[PDB]
């Protein structure tokens, strides 16, 4: 009931037996013959890239609004998977985002953990455009805001419109999980590869966005540690590439 | 140290053998005053310090009485003292040559701190002889086996 998961000869994550969300209903898989357009063979690096990339922990404070990571840029420096983003041209990968919190029984709160495919984001100034430096950092989260952002080339980071101009309660349409600290502790979503082409270049394109939004805010009394660490762990699935070359970009 | 045997061993890169060491100890009476006169019999201790073992700084040291270092007590007038030492190495052979360095950073000496250590041999008189001096001469006849 405290079963350990070992993925590759480097990683150990301890976890109890809970519920998973599998994509839009499909497991990640390898490309078959009547699915690709490229003129070569994939040569998938299964022997080295399937492991757990535990990112840094964020602190869910009382006055926090939400965080998002854009993928696959969220593993740009994470080990050999970041090297394959350099020394290739096309790529195709599913992921198994595992999100878990360490709260006591005297804490309360609720999170919504969404995976949004093609989460294109609007700018904080109309009649203007975003830059790539405001969409995502390479490994750290980007914070939503309670009030209105007002920059020139930034993102409209207000929290109830989710950066996309929609209702934040309707993000339940995409693959999601609720971390309710009363009963739930962890959340694990298995995203497949969703695109309109069989393989894309994973520098320009952002495949999906992982958003973690607190709907019921964190409350605690005065004895308690005044934050709850949220730890995200991403494991790539069935990664395969094409176009061996040097690191042309970055 | 001995060139004649060094050239025969250096026809090969990797060797593996036991040792068969034999000690030919002949003593004599020193001249001068206060002579030995009635000397009863000379006993000699030959100690093999296994590699990484306590090594005597000088005579009448505790290293001599260490249980770890194998020793032979031999009395003069009979057959010479003999001992056999097995293949003592962390490695699987001794190496006459080592194209490499002792530290992992390629630092130190070009092939001298290698695991080719066989140990030491230390010999002294066991007697407590006050009057007279007795000078002994040791001859080591080394021989590899197997």
């Amino acid at each position: 009931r405290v079963r350990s998961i070992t993925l590759g000869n480097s990683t150990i994550t301890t976890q109890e037996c809970a519920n998973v969300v599998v994509g839009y209903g499909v497991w990640p898989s390898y490309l078959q013959d009547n699915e690709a357009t490229a003129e070569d063979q994939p040569t998938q690096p299964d022997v080295a890239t399937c492991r757990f990339y535990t990112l840094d922990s964020i602190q869910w404070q009382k006055e926090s609004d939400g965080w998002w990571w854009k993928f696959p840029e969220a593993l740009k420096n994470m080990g050999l998977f970041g090297q394959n983003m350099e020394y290739h041209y096309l790529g195709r990968s599913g992921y198994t985002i595992h999100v878990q919190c360490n709260a006591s029984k005297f804490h309360q709160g609720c999170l919504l953990v969404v995976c949004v495919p093609e989460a294109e984001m609007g700018c904080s100034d109309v009649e203007r455009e975003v830059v790539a430096a405001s969409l995502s950092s390479e490994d750290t989260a980007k914070s939503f805001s309670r009030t209105e952002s007002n920059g020139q080339h930034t993102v409209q980071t207000v929290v109830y419109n989710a950066g996309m101009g929609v209702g934040v309660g309707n993000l339940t349409i995409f693959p999601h999980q609720w971390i309710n600290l009363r009963t739930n502790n962890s959340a694990t979503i298995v995203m497949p590869y969703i695109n309109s082409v069989p393989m894309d270049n994973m520098f320009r394109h952002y495949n999906f966005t992982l958003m973690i939004i607190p709907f019921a805010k964190l409350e605690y009394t005065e004895q308690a540690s005044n934050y709850v660490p949220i730890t995200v762990t991403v494991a790539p699935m069935c990664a395969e590439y094409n176009g061996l070359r040097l690191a042309s970009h970055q | 140290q001995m060139v004649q045997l060094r050239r025969k061993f250096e026809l090969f890169t990797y060797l593996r053998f036991d040792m068969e060491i034999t000690f030919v100890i002949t003593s004599t009476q020193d001249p001068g005053t206060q002579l030995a006169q009635d000397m009863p019999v000379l006993t000699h201790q030959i100690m093999y310090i296994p590699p990484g073992g306590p090594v005597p700084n000088s005579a009448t040291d505790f290293a001599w009485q260490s249980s770890t270092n194998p020793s032979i007590f031999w009395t003069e007038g009979c057959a010479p003292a003999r001992m056999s030492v097995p293949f003592i190495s962390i490695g699987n052979a001794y190496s006459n040559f080592y194209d490499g360095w002792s530290h992992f950073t390629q630092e130190g000496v070009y092939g001298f701190n290698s695991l080719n250590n066989m140990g030491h041999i230390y010999v002294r008189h066991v007697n407590e002889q006050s009057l007279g001096v007795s000078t002994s001469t040791l001859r080591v006849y080394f021989k590899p086996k197997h």
Epitope: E86, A247 | H103, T105, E107, G108
Partner: antibody, heavy 112, light 114 residues
């Protein structure tokens, strides 16, 4: 922003120059420029810490070595077989692939 | 972080007076592979770029006199200046090769007294 203090060297020998950056060494490499008072600025090389790459101009290949560590967070350049032609002011600069930005000061190498 | 101390921070001295200056490390800059201290000595002439004085904490450079000599081991060092001349009035900085943050010392300012 910081550079080595003025030092006196001897020809046919090496010099180690230091550079100190308050900004974290990520996504952008450390520039190295050699200034000739008679002529212009000359690029020596850059060591890009974000991907860890090390590169030099052909003219300086075999002359300059670029090395940046992580915990010290200081960039170093070493030159060897120094001659009077190496006496010059050497600057370290940053590059976020957006501009060469600024350089700062630098000890005047004085081979003598 | 390894810090490098310098004492005295500065001292004024006349001509033909043997001066020294200590540079003590917060960690022994001597590793047990080659037994070569990782310490560098540097002379930054007044309004000038610094130059090398002593590398490996023991060896001289070309165009450098015997009034610049490395000396020491472990975590404490000094640079003996035997016969001072009119080219030593400057600031001197020691430095370590060991820990990757390559911090320099405080900086002794050998001052000239007329």
């Amino acid at each position: 922003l910081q550079q080595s203090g003025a030092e006196l060297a001897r020809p046919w020998a090496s010099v180690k120059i230091s550079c100190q950056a308050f900004y974290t060494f990520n996504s952008y490499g450390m520039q190295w420029v050699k200034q000739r008072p008679g002529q212009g600025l000359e690029w020596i090389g850059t060591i890009y810490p974000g991907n860890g790459q090390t590169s030099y101009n052909q003219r300086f290949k075999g002359k300059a070595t670029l090395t940046a560590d992580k915990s010290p967070s200081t960039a170093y350049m070493q030159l060897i077989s120094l001659t009077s032609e190496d006496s010059a002011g050497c600057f370290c600069a940053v590059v976020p692939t957006v501009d060469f930005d600024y350089w700062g000061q630098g000890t005047l190498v004085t081979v003598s | 972080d390894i810090v490098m101390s310098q004492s005295p921070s500065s001292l004024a001295v006349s001509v033909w007076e043997k001066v020294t200056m200590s540079c003590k490390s917060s960690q022994s800059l001597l590793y047990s592979n080659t037994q070569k201290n990782y310490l560098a000595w540097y002379q930054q002439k007044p309004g000038q770029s610094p130059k090398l004085l002593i590398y490996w904490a023991s060896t001289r450079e070309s165009g450098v006199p015997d009034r610049f000599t490395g000396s020491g081991s472990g975590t404490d060092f000094t640079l003996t200046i035997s016969s001072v001349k009119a080219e030593d009035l400057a600031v001197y900085y020691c430095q370590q090769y060991y820990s990757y943050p390559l911090t320099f010392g405080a900086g002794t300012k050998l001052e000239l007294k007329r």
